Amino acid sequence: EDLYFQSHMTIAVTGSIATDHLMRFPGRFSEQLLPEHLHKVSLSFLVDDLVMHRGGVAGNMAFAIGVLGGEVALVGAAGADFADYRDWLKARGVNCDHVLISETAHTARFTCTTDVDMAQIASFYPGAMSEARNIKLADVVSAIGKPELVIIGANDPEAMFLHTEECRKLGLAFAADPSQQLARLSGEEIRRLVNGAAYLFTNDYEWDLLLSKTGWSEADVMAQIDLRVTTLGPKGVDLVEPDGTTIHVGVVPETSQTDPTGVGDAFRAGFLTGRSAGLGLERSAQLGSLVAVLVLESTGTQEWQWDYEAAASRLAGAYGEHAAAEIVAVL
């Protein structure tokens, strides 16, 4: 029981802050993935495009929460070059006071290749991100009060656990969002991020990867968390309670599949923004699905716009008049 004052009602977003280099491969990754050679791949894709955008899961989620009008603090480590990115985030209402700025290291670099089917293969060079393990959430809480929720996104692997442990001892609700780091984290490292999570967010691949590396069954997981949120690509999202009562919400139909980078981050930000404003699970995932498709339809993770009227109309089209009115009212 933490007796310190409530930040009311700020979301703290912890996780990576990066520059993304996004490229396109005009072919199919799967077609190149021979099942008998997956033991030791040798893959090289000639790309026809390369563009740079602001990124990092925490930058992406903070940006979207800010666009949607939420109170949000970004907590992560960046290089000295961060001043410009800070102005871009501040322009959408993001509190960047608690970003650790490295004296020596460079802002992290994401290099990603997307194929015609929206599959993606990418590397992430941490640089200054590794110093996130030096950030104390206690000092953040000291300054702005207790957040209603701390998001634990992909980050310096040690930082992900330290931040989670801090949430546990400070009694802060947290969302486990290890998605992007599941490949790097050992089963032991994944297991210690999960217990007591208000939300666990992944896509279905990541859900299978998590269970595969943790050695856990779905039951083992549901006993430790308040809610599992599993995005299903073109099949929408499952929201599962520990019982588990399952709410399913289908996608907002896309007009293009441009670039899927940051789609999960956007869903999570919209959904959590919905939850913060007292919408239920179904309505929150409907709002999330909209921000998600807006990212899918643009190149880069923070290159989407928010038109209130366009939003209501689209929400109406996919979910009906009730959903659209309840959602738009909350914002």
Ligand X SMILES: Nc1nc(F)nc2c1ncn2[C@@H]1O[C@H](CO)[C@@H](O)[C@H]1O
Query: Could you tell me which residues are annotated as the binding site?
Result: 16, 20, 44, 56, 60, 110, 124, 180-181, 203, 231-236, 264-265
Enumerate the known binding-site residues for ATP: 203, 231-236, 264
Return the number of the residue (7 or 113) whose C-beta is nearest a second copy.
113
By CB under 6 A, residue 38 contacts ligand X = no
Examine residue 113 and tell whether it contacts ligand X (CB under 6 A). Answer: no
Residue 176 CB, nearest approach to a second copy (Å): 17
**CB under 6 A: which stretch of 67-75, 185-193, 260-268, 283-291 binds ligand X?**
260-268
Quick one: what does residue 38 bind among ligand X, a second copy, none, with the CB cut-off 5 to 8 Å set by partner type? Answer: a second copy
Q: Mask: binding to ligand X, 152-191, rule CB under 6 A, as x and -?
A: --xx------------------------xx----------
Classify residue 46 as exposed, middle or buried by CB count within 10 Å of its CB (0-12, 13-18, 19+).
Answer: exposed
Helices (H), 178-307: 187-191, 204-214, 218-222, 263-276, 281-296
Point out which span in 46-54, 60-68, 279-287, 309-317 binds a second copy (CB under 8 A).
46-54
Outline where 192-262 has alpha helix (H): 204-214, 218-222
In whole angstroms, give the CA distance from residue 134 to residue 100: 9
Shorter beta-carbon distance to a second copy: residue 158 or 220: 158
Let me know if 265 is a catalytic residue.
Answer: yes
Two tokens, residue 10: 């700020």
Choosing among a second copy, ligand X, none, which partner's interface includes residue 301 (Cβ < 5 to 8 Å by kind)?
Answer: ligand X
178 binds, among a second copy, ligand X, none (CB under 5 to 8 A by kind): none
Among left, alpha and beta (phi > 0; psi -120 to 50; other), residue 220 is alpha
Which one is catalytic: 156, 177, 238, 265? Answer: 265
Least Cα distance to 268 among 296, 250, 289 occurs for: 289
- Interface with a second copy in residues 68-127 (CB under 8 A): 110-113, 117-126
Alpha-carbon distances of 149 from 76, 77, 174, 228, 287, rounded to whole Å:
16, 19, 5, 16, 18
Cα angle 45, 50, 53 (rounded to 5 degrees) comes to: 130
The whole-angstrom distance between residue 128's C-alpha and the CA centroid of its chain comes to 19
Rounded to the nearest whole angstrom, what is the least distance from the CB of residue 67 to a second copy in the complex?
A: 24
Which residues from 164-193 bind a second copy, rule CB under 8 A? 180-181, 183-184
Structure tokens at 136: 């104390």
- List, in order, residues 6 or more apart from 295 with CB less than 8 Å away: 260, 261, 262, 263, 265, 266, 301, 304
Q: 215 by DSSP, 3-state: which? A: coil
Instruction: Give the separation between CA 91 and CA 168, rounded to whole angstroms.
Output: 32
Q: Which of 1, 3, 38, 255 binds a second copy (CB under 8 A)?
A: 38
Which of positions 189-248 make contact with ligand X (CB under 6 A)?
none
- Binding-site residues for substrate, please? 16, 20, 44, 56, 60, 110, 124, 180-181, 265
DSSP letter, residue 194: T
Span 253-312, contacts to a second copy by CB under 8 A: none
Pairing verdict, β 228-231 and 199-203: parallel
- Catalytic residues, by residue number, are 265
Contact residues: ligand X, CB under 6 A: 16, 18, 20, 44, 46, 55-57, 60, 110, 122, 124, 154-155, 180-181, 261-262, 264-265, 301
Contact residues: a second copy, CB under 8 A: 23, 25-27, 29-48, 50, 110-113, 117-126, 157, 180-181, 183-184, 203, 205-206, 208-209, 212-213, 233
